[PDB]
Amino acid sequence: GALTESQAALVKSSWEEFNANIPKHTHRFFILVLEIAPAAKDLFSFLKGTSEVPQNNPELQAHAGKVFKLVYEAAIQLEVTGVVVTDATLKNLGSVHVSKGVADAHFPVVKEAILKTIKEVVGAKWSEELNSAWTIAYDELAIVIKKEMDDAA
Ligand code: HEM
């Protein structure tokens, strides 16, 4: 629905449920990233050097917390305004990803890990409409971040 108010409402409620247990869901998210692309471990300071994904690391928690909140806020923004607006936070973001060695081809990795995270968080409440809602917000945000990366470089 390239975000109907009911699509927006679902992203908000699944985000709230996400954010109710940051320790568990952010740990789950990084397991899912490494299962999809084990080589991505090396990109994160808080991981590189560990055996298993840490369970009580505040840097891991703060980073995965920010990533999910920005997709959520992009979903509201698309629904309200019809676009994802660039800003200071997203151009700064463009600059940190270039520094960290994040490339365009990494985006599908974090997309699949997010969809799989959200499916586990909501359990039986999962729907095709929820999945298509997170998908659209992620893709539209990703477009705008990829631009800034292009531009940061
Ligand atoms: C829509 C998708 C994405 C969002 C909203 C996002 C958001 C962010 C944010 C908000 C930060 C923190 C910036 C700061 O305060 O310095 C961050 C850092 C970072 N992100 Fe992204 N990200 C996305 C995609 C990805 C992807 C695909 C990767 C790579 C697999 C990635 C890897 C990183 C790394 C390595 C850092 C630095 C974290 C650190 O060690 O502090 N991100 N991202």
DSSP labels for 51-74?
Answer: SS--SS-HHHHHHHHHHHHHHHHH
Breaks after residues in the chain, judged by C–N over 2.5 Å: none
Tokens for 24, please give them: 């568990």
CA of 110 to the centre of ligand 1 (A): 9
The label of the residue with tokens 């305004």 reads 81
40, HSE (Cβ side, Cα atoms, 13 Å): 20
CA of 78 to the centre of ligand 1 (A): 21
Ligand 1 contacts CB of residue 15 (under 6 A): no
Contacts of 1 (CB under 8 A, 6+ apart): 7, 129, 132, 133
CATH superfamily entry for domain 1-153: Globins (1.10.490.10)
What values do phi and psi take at 61, rounded to 5?
A: -55, -50
User: In 3D, which of 92, 114, 107, 141 has the Cα closest to residue 15?
Assistant: 114
Contact by Cβ (8 Å): 133, 75: yes
| 4: helix, strand or coil | coil
- Nearest-CA residue for ligand 1 atom 24 is 107
| 126: helix, strand or coil | coil
Contact by Cβ (8 Å): 21, 120: no
* Cα–Cα distance, 25 to 63 (Å, whole number): 12
* Cα–Cα distance, 110 to 40 (Å, whole number): 10
Contact by Cβ (8 Å): 11, 134: yes
CA of 22 to the centre of ligand 1 (A): 17
Resolution of the solved structure (Å): 1.7
Cβ neighbours around 13 below 10 Å, total? 13
The label of the residue with tokens 């463009």 reads 94
- The sign of the dihedral angle between the CA atoms of 48, 67, 26, 112 is negative
Tokens for 18, please give them: 């996400």
Tokens for 50, please give them: 């560990």
3 in the Ramachandran plot: left (φ > 0), alpha (ψ -120 to 50) or beta?
left
